[PDB]
Structure formats: C-alpha cells, structure tokens
Design a protein around this ligand. Structure first.
Ligand SMILES: [Zn+2]
Ligand SMILES: [Zn+2]
Lengths: 99, 1333, 90
DNA sequence: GTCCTATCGATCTTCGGAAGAGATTCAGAG
DNA sequence: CTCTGAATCTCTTCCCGCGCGCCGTAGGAC
C-alpha cells in the first residue's frame, strides 16, 4: 500500500489510518527519536507539519511541488491547537507568548 | 500566531467569559429527522459558527459578497466555517463547583491551602456537613466542620453570630477570605517555632504553595469553577453512521448531563424548592461536573453501554491513546507506504528497489510537476487522468523524476537510529521492496514475511539531509561502539570461508602461478581446485607515513582461493589478512582495517565486492546439509552405559542409607554433567577428525569439510551448542521451578527423542518463549524512560575549560581482568598531562584526544589509570561541552557541536534490552592496598581490615589480579611475595566471623555471669563445651546491659601499649558467639577469641536507573571516628558513632537481624560498611562523592551487559547519570534569594553562585541530589515535557497553580509545537539566530 | 551521482553545515535558477550542489560574497532608474 | 408506531496483577 | 500528649507497527 493524498480525519486533520481506507503510515515516537539521533531537523519539521498536520501549509507545499519549487511553509500543527482548546475547556488558561 | 513561550495559569471566570462567544442553554444539538443544528444548543450556529462552508444557516447569503455580515433570519454570522472549531462557549453554573483536579491531585491543593484534610473537604463538598465561617462570638473555629446534629445545636445555642455553610460555597468563602501573604508570613515564622521534621517538611510544602500563589496572579477562588467553558463543537463531532443516526459522542453526553442538571437547579431555585431538594440537586450537579471533567475519579464512572465508561476531558488529554502520544509526538504522514520486503543481492549498498506501483503512487505530484514542465499535459485535471492512464510515457516521467530522490525505509520496531535509512530507489516489476543484504543486519530484518515502510522526502533540504545523514553509506559504523554495522552476512561469510580454505592434496597442487589473474583463469578452465596449495606472485601497496603508496612485489605461498580473492582487496592492505580461512570474526576485522586505512569510499565498494564474491563462490560451493552429515560418535553408547551405571552406585548408597537425600542429587547431576562433557568432546573430535586424505603417500588428517562443521566454524549459523544438541546429547533440562532434571535427555535430534524426553523439552521451550514475550515490553518501557530523561542534552559548546574527569582502569574482578584499558579510554580526551611511567616525565598533553595511535602508545607503556574528561563533570550550563563527550563513535572524529547525544545514548542503552533476561590464577606480586590489619602467632598479617585487598603487578608491572582479604583472614602470601598461580594466597573461615585480639595476655569474663549472659550448654557430642553467649533478644536487660566483654588483663593494670595509643585491650562478644578462651586463658596475638556463625538481568538495571533503595540496605558508615553502641535492641537497636573532633553521638537506629561489621570500638569512616549487601546510590552520592557514585553506576550497569555479551560504550551511561543528578538541594540559603532548604536545579544554583561570587557575596552551598529517571523526568522546569510523559493529570495542575512558563528548550517541546529541534541543522539555525542578536 | 559525501565533509568541516550550504546553493539553482558551476549529468540540483562543494568552489563565504555583490548591483540599477526618472520629469 | 426522558432513585459492578511510591493513620515513649 | 517509626490506603505504570472480522440508547406514553 502507498498513499500520496486522500482522506483526512476530522477532529485532527491528520491523514486516515488503514488499508481499507486510503491512509498513510504512522510515524511513531521511536522514529522521531531516530531522526533526532541524526541532526535531521528539516526532515522532522516537514514530517510533522506539512505532510500531516498544517492544513494551509500542506496545500502551499502541494502547489510548490507541482510548480517545482520544493519549499515548505510549516506554520503550526493543528492538532496542537486542538490540544490547547482541550486544556482551555478546563479551568486552565494556557496561551502562547510573544517574548 | 508567532510565539516564543507558553504560559500556563489558572483562568479567572471573567477570563472564561472572554473566551466564550455565547452561553449554551438548551441541551439539544440537532433534530432527529432534519440535520439542522438547534439554536442555543451544544451546536448552536450563532454561538460557535455556521455549518455551511460560506453560507448562513438561514440561507439569506451564499456568497463571499456577504462575508462578515450578520443575518437576522437565524442569527448566525457568515464567515469561514473553520472558525467553528475555534469559538468556545460557557455555561454559567447556578452555584459554584469545585474543580475536581485541584480537589484530588496527589496532594489536595485546595486542602493544602486551607490546611484541611481531604476527607473533610470532600465531606463538605458533597453536602454532608456544615462548616462554620465567620463564627464571631462563638466557640466555633475558623473552619471547624460540624455535622447536621451539631448544626442543629448551633442553630439554637447561637443565633446569627455564626455562619456555617455547606459544600463548595463554604470553601469558596474560605478561599475568598484567605489573607494569603499575612498567612504565609505567619507560617514562615511559625516554622522556626518547632523542629517537628514530620511537620516541618509539609510546612515547607504549604509555605511553598503559599509563595507560589502569592507570586502568581492567581486568586484562590479560581480553584472553584463558576463558568464552565464548552469545547468548540467541531472538535467533538456528532458524525452520522450508516443510516439516519449520528455516532455517540462522549463529551457531548457529559455536557448534556451537566446542562440538564443545572437547568433543573435553576428551575427549582426559581420555584423555591425546599432546602433538602435543592441541596440534593446541588450535590448531583457537582458530581455531574466531576463526571464531565475527570470521569473515573468519581465513586464509579458513568457509562451508556455495556459498562464502557465514558471518556472525559482529562481522559482525552493523557493516556497512551491520549493526544500527547497518539497525535502530537507521533502522527500519521502522507506520502508514505509499506510493503513486504525481499532480498535483492544485485543492489549496491546505497540502492533499494521499489515497486513501480508504489513509486507511481508516492511520486504523483512530482509527476504532475513534470507533465506541465514537459508540456505534455494541460493541467492537473489532465495530468491526473494521464497518470491514471498509466501511459507508457508516464513511466519515462517516473524514471526521470526518481533519478536522484532518496527514499526513507523504516522497518518497525525501530529501536536504534540505524533502523531508518535513506536509499536511492530503482524501479522493480514486482510488489516487494528489494532490500540489500548487508543492510538487513542493521534493521535486524529477517525476510520471513517482514513488512517495512517507505517515506518520500519532499523539500530540498529534506533530500540533502537524507543523502548526507541517513544514507546507507554514511552509517557504516555503529554509534554504540566501534563496531561496523555492515558485518558480513551469514551466507557471504560461508562463501569466503569455503573459498579461502586449503586442503592437503588437491587438483592443481604445488605449481607456480604468475599472478592472481592466471589463478582465476586456471579455476575457470577447471585445471585447478580452489583449495589447492600454490605459489603465486603477489604484489601489494603500502601507504607510507606521509600517505603515498609504495609498491612491493614478492612470491607468496598461498592457496588458489586466496589468490583469487586478492583481486578484490583494495590497494592498501597486507596479504596476511587473506592468507587465512576467513570467518565471521576474521572477515570483520579485515573490513574494519580497510576503513582504518583506505577510507569510506574504498570501504563501501570493497564491502560490495566482498558480498558479490561470497555469494558467487558460495553458490559454486553447493554446501548442502543432509542426515548423512550429522555424526554420532561411536563411543557415545559406551559413555552412557558407564555414566548411568555410576548413578546406580550413587543410588546404591541411597539404597544402603550411606548418603543423604541432597548429596545423592548433587552427585548424580554432577556425574551426568561430566558425561555430557565427555560426549560433547568425543563428538566434536570426531567431527573434526572425519577428514583424512592421502598426500601422495601415507594418510594424513586435516580440517573437516563437513557441512555442519563449515557452518559452525565460519560462524554463519549453528555454534557449538547447536551441533552439540544435533550430534552429542541434548543433555540436562530444568523444571519450571528451575530444578535440574536428574535424568538428562540422553538423545540428540538426529536420533528420535521419545515422548517423555519431548515433554521435558517443552518446559524449556515455553519458558523461553514466554520470557521473550514478556521482556520485549519492559525493554521498550526502559527505552522510553531513558529518552524522556535524557532528551535535553546536546553538544552545544566546544570546550568547557574544566580539568577534572574520571580515572579509567581495566576491570579486574574475580581475579583476572575482564576488559582492557584501551576499550575504556579510546576516543576520550585527556583530563590532564598524561605522564610517562615513573616520575616527573609527562607523555600526553593535558587535553589531547586519545585516539587509536595514542591508545597504542599508552598500551606500550605500563599505564593502567588514566583520567579523562566525562560528560557528568562538564561545567556547561543547560548543555554539554564537546570536549568531554569526545569521539563520535559513528564518525571517528570528535563530536560536532549540535548533536543530540541524549537520544543517541538512550537508544544505545535500550537497543539490547531485548537481549537480557526477564526471568590465585596467575603468578604475580602481592600488593595489599587498604591494609588495616595487625599481626598474629605467625604475624602473617592479623587481618584487621574489612578492606585490605592485595593486588598483582604482573611480569609487565600490570595489576592483572587483586581481591578483598576479609576481616580476620591470615595472609599466607603477603608483603609483596611473588606467588605462582594456584598456590594458596590466604585462608578464611567460610562459615563464621572470627574476632581476634592484638596483644598476648590473660583474660577474664569481665562483667559476665553464667545464666545472665551465657548458657551452660553441654555439647552433647563430647560433654566439654565452648560457652555460648546469650543474645540481646534471648535475654532481658539483665544480660543486655550486662554486655559480654573479653578485655585482656595483666598484672600491671594495663596492656602492652602500641606507641601513641592509650586504648586498653578491651574486647567483647556479640550474639550467637562461640568462645573457648574462657577465664584464666592466655590469648595470644592473632588468636581467635570466638566465632559467630551466619542479582538479575534487565530488572537489575531497570531498578538501578530508577535508583530504587535496596530491600537489604547495606548500611554504610558516615563521617569518621570510632563506633559505639547506644542502648540495646528493644523494638530495634540504637547505636552511636563517636569522632572526638566531630559528632561524638552521631546516632543511628539499626535492625537487629542485620549482623554488624563493627561491634564497639572499630575505626569507621564515611562510607564504611556496617553490613553486607548492595549499597544505595543516593547514600553513595551523599557519602563518597559524585565520581564515586558515577563509577558505581557505570560498573554495576556494565556488569549486566558484560555477562550477556553486549558491548556498550561507557560514555552512553554517564549522560544518563548526568541527568539523574541534575538537581541539587540547598544546604544554606546564603546570599542567594533561595529558600533556606529547597531543591533547585543545579544549573540555576551554579550560575547564581557564579555571579554571586563574582560580586563577592556568599554563594549558596548545595548537595547534588540523585533523582531516579522516572521522577527526574517529571521534575523538569518545563512542564510540557513532563506532562507529555506521565501523570499528566497531576503535572497539569501542579504547574498550573505555580503559574509556570515554558521556554520550549529541548527537543520534545519543539516537536510538539512543530518547529525545528534545537539539534543538528535546527541547532545551526538557532545558533545563527542567537549569534545574530 | 554521489555514493558518499566524505570529500565535501572534509571540505566543509561539519556534517551539518554542508547540508545547509548545499541547501542554499540548490535552492539558488532551482528557483530563479542560476546555472551551476559544474557540468550537469541530468542530475537533480541537490547532487549538483554536492558536486560543486567537492570541487571546493561553493561555501558560506563565497555565497555571502555573491549575495552582497548581487545586492549592490541591484541597488546600482536603482540609482540609475531614480536619476533617469528625475531627469524625465523636467 | 412514533417520540419522548433518563441513568439499581427495593443492584452489586468481579475476586486470575505486581509494584512502587507517596499519603494517611497508629505505636512506644519522652 | 503528641514526636518519629511503621503500616495500610489510594493512584499510576506496563514495546509497535501492520491486517481483518463484528457491534455499536431504552422504556413507556399519546
Ligand atoms: Zn443564517
Ligand atoms: Zn566539558
């Protein structure tokens, strides 16, 4: 099985998982550790923002790849924002900071 | 939004109202027939956002032309529907409600703040009893909870001069009444009022909480929820299923319950329901909010199915299925796939074959990017269609796109970094992924149906990073040790072993060949045999010291196979490497030497050529295996027939009563073991002897070409323990309880095993399988703990400038050395000027890396101890200096600045975790060091040291031997005698501990009475007895306080004094003693007064890293001086340690059953052992120093791997140790603003003391505290990493009340927020950002 | 094609800085593509960059030199355009 | 039959997990 | 009379991918 682009999950916009569904392989925590074992940071940033989570970014990446530019704009993984809402639904005010 | 920090704190109710866009009132979402969202519900359109993409619900506007306007037919605002997933609402509770988290954390934060027990606060909150507030002129305290009968009393005893509320309202009034700062000042002065250390510690916790609440902007009532925000609906969809039904949503139902209960409460309060009813409704509402928040912390979780409890918000936050480990740290990625792998031997080391279909389905956009660029397709609409058409031109497009684009291959489970690698792909017709043979070792990839995944790197930097860091050819050395990961495969080594072997008489023997090429031609013409002995003119190149090859040619006596192989070895090596029958060991070093000399680029091609030649000539070998090849030595039947008979004799003794039960067992099993050894030796000898050949005359034997023998000897598969079971005897077995079977499995698999033998074998087989299945999980858990404790460390500076370090010596234990010095010290930098053996002459500079040449130079000298810099001792704040870490084991040079050492070390420790188990010898010179003995009747050292250990400078002046001569041992071989191996060095009583005197003189039972302190035993064996001393437990104070003493007496009133010593020869007796030298007996020096008679694999390291205290704590003595007893053992004994200049009464309670290494007058020091058994890493650090605890940890964690044969570089452990003691506890607050006694991060305390001493003010004094990994991971100052690990429901409150702020330093936090990690190329970017600032 | 990158690593004394420099050069050669300083072999810009580095004709300093000079040329054309605009208005 | 409100608001939720550590209660005595 | 020991309670933790298969609010009132 192999997946380029297809269905995306609703609560978090990560791609679906499975064969009967047009899903992609899960990049587990052990794989993240192995990538960090090398100095690969751009690889990780792509793998966890553009390929999977940042909805606006993964389209601008698609356009650049078709255009032959091969440059990504990571933005921010939507799942993290979901987490923030999930914590903000409690009595916790967690927020980003400028400085 | 761009950000640089994350701040967590309590949310004020008006802040919640600021979050909200509306107040949800009706607990309905959508109609059950129409799919429109009901207004003022959980899915209200005007509250959270419109459902339609860009249209309002009422349909008044369906265009961007009306974007941002407000309709008045339904009330929904028209904009992008995505905002619907961001807007929140809020429910205004009809009455206050306590936040469940803050009520029932590990401590009770609300309880701690009010200093009110959790049981009582819970009793109040659930409306069980009143609590008096503003008690005024009443005998009712500040809180003073009171029951309903008590309230009924107060209702008439007093009027309204008291107020007694119920539930959270009373707690809110208490919170609203908290004069926090004045309270903290009072408690911090009351702290000095008492020393109750069973209360001072919790008082420090309470004041710390008060200070944290004072400093933060948080206010007490914020612990009580008043407005509960609702999650945006798009995060909790009511998705439909097959048919007109919508899938059940847990949070939606929890919110529905809460809304219904609260609306009922409002209705009643409007209609003035009686107090009892409203109290019950308020209790139900509080419990429903509890179920919404942290369902399960209630008495019982609610469910809407077959007892499947509903997941709450806190359930969605934490857990293995929670967001943190399910969606943030690891997320599914597009442009990836998986397939079943297969071996393609034709591939180069840097290539991999992928199916055409997978390539087309992964590189689709790149193909579009060519169809437009080629102009062959109009746009995407036609490009996708053409790709679907699988046009023959599309394959030319794919063959052009895929030309130089790496693909990542990732078998899972990827324990170590070598499990993910980049490969240049090549199209293959089939559907399996073609993998290279030499790489499969790194993946641990057996091709018996093993799936593997591919990921396509898209951006430019990703491609470059794959080619530069993750390429197969860039990972030829293992990062865990100086070991190649391209170690030749099982089949290839068999081929080389078969090719280079030599036979006595063979075709084409003895001639002269003019060169390797002519040899090869001869073989291919069939005129010569491969194993034929021949003389070929060989030519070799050796690069000089400067680096230019020098050609030398000679005639060489060798074999045809070796001459053929020499055509592949590169032009830099000596012929002596190929002039031997190569095996999995001998070849490996060969390859390593190539990497040592030629370089990476020659090495990779040499490895590929070795693989090719090995495969070809192994195919030519045709080394089949058959039943004819398993040989049973003919003598075996006799070896059985005798050995069993011997057991019969051991049985006959048992048949005669001449032996005990156990002795029969331990004689039979030993005889069977000896028989098994004899059978195995005869079988091996026959296997090697089975070949004898005629060399032109007279038969001569030689090494055997038996298939099994070549498989075993080449090291491919099937070692001695396998061939022994296949051709010797299966041998003994063990029961599930571990007992050795008295009747071994006398058969071997070539012969048939009978039914009982097989049933016996099943015990071991299933035990091993279950061991594997259970240990495969604990290994992974250990890996996770290691990565989450060490994720932070990165080499972020070149030189720290420190000069300390740790001294490396060869491991000498159990006599002979178990590992050399070179292994320890290779690849580190010197701590200070290495010196020449002798005096006043240095040998190596003070900060030079000890690479291979300097390691050889040191081994050339007699240097045993070398101090080298270590990662633990580096003085770099929030990072590690490069010089301490030293060599990058995967590169050979010093480690670059920016590498994430922490994850590498964690993987290095955790990779072999599935290999563990979850269930005088040579002549030398005598070097007693640590000697604290005296002299006896021979003077052979009256061993008075619980330390003395004699070492052994070898014939090369090298300590190759040493151990601990126990107290009371007699040193036969002492004072530096030279003694040969096997000649008794010293003697000991293996059963009892003897006590000995120093002087020779008369004695009396001083202050001893028969019956009171000794028992008049008879010694029924003879009738003449040695008196038995009464214990402290077998006698009361009339015998406990009458402690036995055997003080030596003389006519002068004092004993012969040692110069400068006034101590009389006072000696005593402990319990269980047996003493013969009674009153009137002359005891000589060295005479024994009396005698007193008396582990794991993976867990042994898992508990070591967690720093668990031992079940049997070997008590180490502290400070110094001479020990004493206090009062005797009642409940548990009490002792005292006296230093004249020191705590003369350093007291300490002691267990009774633990025998003591000191009795009443033994000189003691900090760390001195009072009892045997394992020590405590915490105590070791506190008493012997950081270097000492580091050495203990490294050696005791290496003794587990050395036993199991796993080799891991010692440095990989020290990094973890650096993480364990990253915290320090303040001793004196000093001029620092730190608390009097507090645990602060050691980096912060060190930097503060640095600037303070720079200004000349009193720097803080601290003790570095050893925290176990499981806790040190959660103890960090960055709450995101801790909360991502475990106990999130606790950390997310503890940090909340503290008003914590995260700087996002570290790898895990940056991975969560989706930015570049502060390591590698990310470190380069961050460093550029900080330098350009 | 490149099987190893050891020579460039010896040139740019860091495994990581080589990645970033090659990223800079290959990005230049790809979008607004400057022609490379090495004969092509139908390669992707990535490998061509790693070809140029091994020839020792591209690094951080050289790229910064080129960038600064290119910026100066772009500012120089600005002065001529501003002056010509000022002359034409009179 | 469809459409509504609500949870064993006259039970018994499973005993066949280890363990590891804090927290919370209780002794022998100063 | 309550101070340091233990002693008993609750809370939390347990490798990782793949691939199916099925199953998925309830009772009673208008
Ligand atoms: Zn509308
Ligand atoms: Zn350092």
């Amino acid at each position: 099985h192999a997946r380029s682009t297809g269905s995306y999950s609703l609560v978090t916009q990560q791609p679906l998982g499975g064969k009967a569904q047009f899903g992609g392989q899960r990049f587990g925590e052990m794989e993240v550790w192995a990538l960090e074992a090398y100095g690969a940071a751009y690889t990780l940033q792509e793998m966890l923002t553009v390929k999977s989570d940042d909805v606006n970014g993964r389209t601008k990446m698609y356009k650049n790849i078709v255009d032959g530019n091969h440059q990504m704009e990571p933005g921010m993984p939507e799942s993290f924002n979901v987490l923030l809402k999930e914590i903000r639904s409690l009595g916790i005010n967690i927020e980003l900071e400028d400085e | 939004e761009e950000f640089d920090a994350i701040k967590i704190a309590l949310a004020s109710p008006d802040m919640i109202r600021s979050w909200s866009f509306g107040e949800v009132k009706k607990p309905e979402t959508i109609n059950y027939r129409t799919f429109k969202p009901e207004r003022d519900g959980l899915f209200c359109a005007r509250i959270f956002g419109p459902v339609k993409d860009y249209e309002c619900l009422c349909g008044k506007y369906k265009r961007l032309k009306h974007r941002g306007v407000i309709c008045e037919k339904c009330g929904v605002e028209v904009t992008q529907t995505k905002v619907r997933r961001e807007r929140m609402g809020h429910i205004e509770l009809a009455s206050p409600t306590a936040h469940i988290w803050f009520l029932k954390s590990l401590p009770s934060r609300i309880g701690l703040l009010l200093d009110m027990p959790l049981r009582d606060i819970e009793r109040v909150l659930y409306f069980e009893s009143y609590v008096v507030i503003e008690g005024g002129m009443t005998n009712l305290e500040r809180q003073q909870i009171l029951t309903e009968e008590q309230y009924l009393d107060a209702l008439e005893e007093f009027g309204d001069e008291f107020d007694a509320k119920m539930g959270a309202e009373a707690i809110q009034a208490l919170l609203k009444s908290m004069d926090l700062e004045q309270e903290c000042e009072q408690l911090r002065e009351e702290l000095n009022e008492t020393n109750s250390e069973t209360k001072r510690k919790k008082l420090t916790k309470r004041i710390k909480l008060l200070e944290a609440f004072v400093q933060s902007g948080n206010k007490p009532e914020w612990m009580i929820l008043t407005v509960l925000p609702v999650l945006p609906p798009d995060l909790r969809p009511l998705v439909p299923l097959d048919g007109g039904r919508f899938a059940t949503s847990d949070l939606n139902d929890l919110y529905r319950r809460v809304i219904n209960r609260n609306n009922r409460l409002k209705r009643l309060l409007d209609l003035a329901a009686p107090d009892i009813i409203v109290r019950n409704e308020k209790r139900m509402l509080q419990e429903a909010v509890d179920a919404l928040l942290d369902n399960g912390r209630r008495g019982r979780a609610i469910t809407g199915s077959n007892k499947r409890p509903l997941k709450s918000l806190a359930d969605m936050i934490k857990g293995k299925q929670g967001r943190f480990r399910q969606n943030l740290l690891g997320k599914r990625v597009d442009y990836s796939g998986r397939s079943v792998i297969t071996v393609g031997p034709y591939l180069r080391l840097h290539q991999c074959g992928l199916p055409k279909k997978m390539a087309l389905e992964l590189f689709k956009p790149f193909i579009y990017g060519k169809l437009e660029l080629r102009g062959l397709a109009t746009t995407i609409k036609a490009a996708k269609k053409m790709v679907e058409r699988e046009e023959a031109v599309v394959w030319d497009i794919l063959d052009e796109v895929i030309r130089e684009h790496p693909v990542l291959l990732n078998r899972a489970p990827t324990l170590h970094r070598l499990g993910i690698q980049a490969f240049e792909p090549v199209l293959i017709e089939g559907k399996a992924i073609q993998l290279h043979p030499l790489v499969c070792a790194a993946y641990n990839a057996d091709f018996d149906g093993d799936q593997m995944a591919v990921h396509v790197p898209l951006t430019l930097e990703a491609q470059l990073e794959a080619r530069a860091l993750m390429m197969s050819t860039n990972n030829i050395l293992s990062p865990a040790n100086g070991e190649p990961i391209i170690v030749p495969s099982q089949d290839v080594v068999l081929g080389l072993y078969y090719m280079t072997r030599d036979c006595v008489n063979a075709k084409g023997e003895g001639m002269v060949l003019t060169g390797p090429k002519e040899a090869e031609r001869l073989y291919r013409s069939g005129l010569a045999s491969l194993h034929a002995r021949v003389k070929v003119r060989i030519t070799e190149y050796e690069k000089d010291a400067n680096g230019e090859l020098v050609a030398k040619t000679s005639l060489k006596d060798t074999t045809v196979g070796r001459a053929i192989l020499w055509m592949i070895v590169p032009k830099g090596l000596p012929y002596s490497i190929v002039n031997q029958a190569l095996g999995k060991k001998a070849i490996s070093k060969m390859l390593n030497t190539c990497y040592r000399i030629l370089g990476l680029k020659p090495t990779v091609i040499f490895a590929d050529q070795i693989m090719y030649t090995g495969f070809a000539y192994a195919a030519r070998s045709g080394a089949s295996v058959g039943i004819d090849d398993m040989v049973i030595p003919e003598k075996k039947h006799e070896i059985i027939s005798e050995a069993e008979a011997e057991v019969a004799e051991i049985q006959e003794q048992f048949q005669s009563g001449l032996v005990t039960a156990g002795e029969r067992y331990n004689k039979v099993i030993d005889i069977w073991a000896a028989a098994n050894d004899r059978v195995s030796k005869a079988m091996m000898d026959n296997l090697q002897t089975e070949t004898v050949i005629n060399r032109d005359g007279q038969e001569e034997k030689q090494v055997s070409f038996n298939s099994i023998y070549m498989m075993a000897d080449s090291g491919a598969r099937g070692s001695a323990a396998q061939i022994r079971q296949l051709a010797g005897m299966r041998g003994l077995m063990a029961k599930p309880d571990g007992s050795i079977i008295e009747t071994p499995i006398t058969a071997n698999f070539r012969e048939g095993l009978n039914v009982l033998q097989y049933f016996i074998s099943t015990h071991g087989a299933r035990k091993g399988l279950a061991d594997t299945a259970l240990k495969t999980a604990n290994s992974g858990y250990l890996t996770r703990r290691l990565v989450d404790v060490a994720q932070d460390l990165v080499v972020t500076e070149d030189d720290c400038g420190t000069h300390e370090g740790i001294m490396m010596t060869p491991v000498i234990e159990g006599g002979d050395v178990k590992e050399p010095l070179r292994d320890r010290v290779l690849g580190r930098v010197t701590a200070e000027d290495v010196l020449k053996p002798g005096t006043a002459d240095i040998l190596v500079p003070r900060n030079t890396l000890l690479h291979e040449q300097w390691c050889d130079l040191l081994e050339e000298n007699s240097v045993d101890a070398v101090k080298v810099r270590s990662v633990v001792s580096c003085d770099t704040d929030f990072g590690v200096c490069a010089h301490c870490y030293g060599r990058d084991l995967a590169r050979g040079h010093i480690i670059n600045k920016g590498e994430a050492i922490g994850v590498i070390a964690a993987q290095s420790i955790g990779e072999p975790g599935t290999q563990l188990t979850m269930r005088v010898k040579n002549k030398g010179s005598i070097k007693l060091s640590n000697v604290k003995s005296v002299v006896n009747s021979s003077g052979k050292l009256v061993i008075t040291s619980r330390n003395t250990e004699l070492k052994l400078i070898d014939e090369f002046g090298r300590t190759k031997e040493s151990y601990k001569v126990p107290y009371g041992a007699v040193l036969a071989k002492g004072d530096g005698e030279q003694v040969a191996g096997g000649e008794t060095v010293a003697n000991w009583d293996p059963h009892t501990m003897p006590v000995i005197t120093e002087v020779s003189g008369f004695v009396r039972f001083t202050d001893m009475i028969d019956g009171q302190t000794i028992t008049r035993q008879t010694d029924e064996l003879t009738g003449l007895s040695s008196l038995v001393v009464l214990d402290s437990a077998e006698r009361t104070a009339g015998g406990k306080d009458l402690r036995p003493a055997l003080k030596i007496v003389d006519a002068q009133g004092n004993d012969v004094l040692i110069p400068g010593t006034d101590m009389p020869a006072q000696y005593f007796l402990p319990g269980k003693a047996i003493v013969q030298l009674e009153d009137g007996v002359q005891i000589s020096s060295g005479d024994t007064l009396a005698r007193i008679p008396q582990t794991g694999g993976l867990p042994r390291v898992a508990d070591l890293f967690e720093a668990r205290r031992p079940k049997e704590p070997a008590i180490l003595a502290e400070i110094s001086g001479i020990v004493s007893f206090g009062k005797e053992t009642k409940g548990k004994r009490r002792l005292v340690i006296t230093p004249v200049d020191g705590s003369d009464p350093y007291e300490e309670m002691i267990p009774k059953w633990r025998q003591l290494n000191v009795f009443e007058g033994e000189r003691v020091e900090r760390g001195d052992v009072i009892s045997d058994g394992p020590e405590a890493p915490h105590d070791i650090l506190r008493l012997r120093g950081v270097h000492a605890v580091t050495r203990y940890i490294v050696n005791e964690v290496q003794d587990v791997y050395r036993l199991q044969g796993v080799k891991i570089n010692d440095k990989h452990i020290e990094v973890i140790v650096r993480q364990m003691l990253r915290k320090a506890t303040i001793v004196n607050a000093g001029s620092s603003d730190f608390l009097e006694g507090e645990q602060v991060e050691y980096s912060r305390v060190k930097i503060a003391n640095r600037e303070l001493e720079a200004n000349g003010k009193v720097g803080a004094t601290y003790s570095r505290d050893l925290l176990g990994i499981t806790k040190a991971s959660l103890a960090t100052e960055s709450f995101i990493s801790a909360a991502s690990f475990q106990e999130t429901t606790r950390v997310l409150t503890e940090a909340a009340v503290a008003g914590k702020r995260d700087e996002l330093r570290g790898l895990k936090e940056n991975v969560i927020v989706g930015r570049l990690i502060p390591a590698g190329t990310g470190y380069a970017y961050h460093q550029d950002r900080m330098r350009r600032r | 094609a490149r099987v190893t990158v050891q020579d460039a690593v010896e040139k740019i004394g860091n495994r990581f800085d080589l990645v970033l420099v090659a990223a800079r050069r290959a990005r230049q050669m790809q979008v607004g593509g400057k022609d490379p300083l090495v004969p092509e072999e139908n390669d992707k810009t990535t490998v061509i960059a790693l070809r140029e580095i091994e020839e020792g004709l591209i690094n951080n300093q050289i790229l910064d030199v080129r960038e600064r000079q290119e910026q100066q040329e772009q500012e120089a054309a600005e002065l001529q355009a501003v002056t010509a605009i000022a002359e034409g208005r009179r």
